[PDB]
Design a protein around this ligand. Structure first.
Ligand SMILES: N[C@@H](CCC(=O)N[C@@H](CS)C(=O)NCC(=O)O)C(=O)O
Ligand SMILES: N[C@@H](CCC(=O)N[C@@H](CS)C(=O)NCC(=O)O)C(=O)O
Lengths: 221, 221
């Protein structure tokens, strides 16, 4: 049939909404005529370029997010839980090491990107564990089924210039597309380019794609 | 059968997303076991009684909104078109008048609230006409099917203290629920209270209610 439409998903494991958007597209890549391309980006890098302000700046907005997540995780069926101090410890510690590792993985082990991204989320957004320390990142990759030698090998590269600039490029591409936050999904359909922000634009995306929307947890074939 | 669940929708005709959320709930009040209670509120008051600035302050973000509206109007099937001087004209001015009239309508002519609200949006958000002048607001009420004498009568009360404070009270109730923008929908289900922001949370609202989601334009049959 018709060539699949390419979907570029820009995300940062630091983001709970990115994990929601990510699981939804991951589920639909076996149902819609699409080709999912995972693009590891840095939220901080995107908020920096886009000159975007902290969505928490507003007391009711930040509060709202923390009360919303526990409801959305049920709908989307993603085992996540609001950290003990998200806006404090995880956000300020950062994700550069994680995002750079995922970048290395997308360059050398593209078939593991999905699972390793999921494991890093399981740590920070499911078990409130740390994902800034090499041995922790390494544990995530190993749970994702990656061999210890291979994981360590990629980890050794996150300090490389190839990987460092690959991350900066990938997050610059998202801004060039107009990104101002994550998740950002860019859909390439019949010569057109759509940029959708958030994990609640998957139903609009189906419409633009001419695909059928069946909820965040569509029925497996 | 179980008593219907009350859904409170806070909206301001100034808001294009409030109109989207508004039409969605208006179409589902015939399908879901719910009771829709339209609550006219003033965005500006919500923006103040919460300290939340206009979302267009982030350059990349205002642009996203104006590009997204044309796509969402199709999905939702709502005849809207983006104004010209949205800022130094429609917004800079205000809707205080239109929201006060809608408040008077909700107090004396509750069965016309829906239609009149829909006609005021048709003006500002569909034909880019004005809705700050009495004779204009009047025109909206007439197209809604409201007799000119009745409409004029209500218009004469928008200066009253009853009406003025009713609008302030209603928009304050939104803030007490945690509102930081519009549309804000508050669902009361089994003793629990959910506050959902946006026209893109109806699919989560359906899950919380135990109802079936069938897109922004459910099968009226
Ligand atoms: N409404 C979106 C919210 C997504 C969101 O708030 N993402 C955060 C990072 S986890 C962000 O990038 N925000 C930028 C903004 O709100 O302008 C959803 O339901 O997924
Ligand atoms: N993504 C939401 C956006 C709703 C929105 O942007 N609402 C505006 C008024 S029209 C607001 O009150 N924004 C406050 C904010 O974004 O913090 C939707 O699809 O409804």
């Amino acid at each position: 049939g018709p060539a699949p439409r390419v979907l570029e998903l820009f995300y940062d494991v630091l983001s709970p909404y990115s994990w929601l958007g990510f699981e939804v597209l991951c589920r639909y890549q076996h149902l819609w005529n699409i080709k999912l391309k995972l693009r590891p980006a840095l939220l901080a890098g995107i908020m920096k370029d886009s000159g975007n302000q902290p969505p928490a700046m507003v007391p009711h907005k930040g509060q709202y997010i923390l009360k919303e997540i526990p409801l959305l995780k049920q709908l989307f069926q993603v085992p996540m839980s609001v950290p003990k101090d998200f806006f404090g410890e995880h956000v300020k510690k950062g994700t550069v090491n994680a995002m750079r590792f995922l970048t290395a993985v997308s360059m050398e082990q593209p078939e593991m990107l999905e699972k390793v991204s999921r494991e890093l989320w399981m740590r920070i957004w499911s078990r409130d564990e740390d994902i800034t320390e090499s041995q922790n990142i390494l544990s995530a990759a190993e749970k994702a089924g990656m061999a210890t030698a291979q994981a360590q090998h990629l980890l050794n590269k996150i300090s490389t210039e190839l990987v460092k600039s690959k991350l900066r490029e990938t997050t610059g591409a998202a801004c060039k597309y107009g990104a101002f936050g994550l998740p950002t999904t860019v859909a390439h359909v019949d010569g057109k380019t759509y940029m959708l922000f958030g994990s609640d634009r998957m139903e609009l995306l189906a419409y633009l794609l001419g695909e059928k929307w069946m909820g965040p947890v569509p029925p497996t074939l």
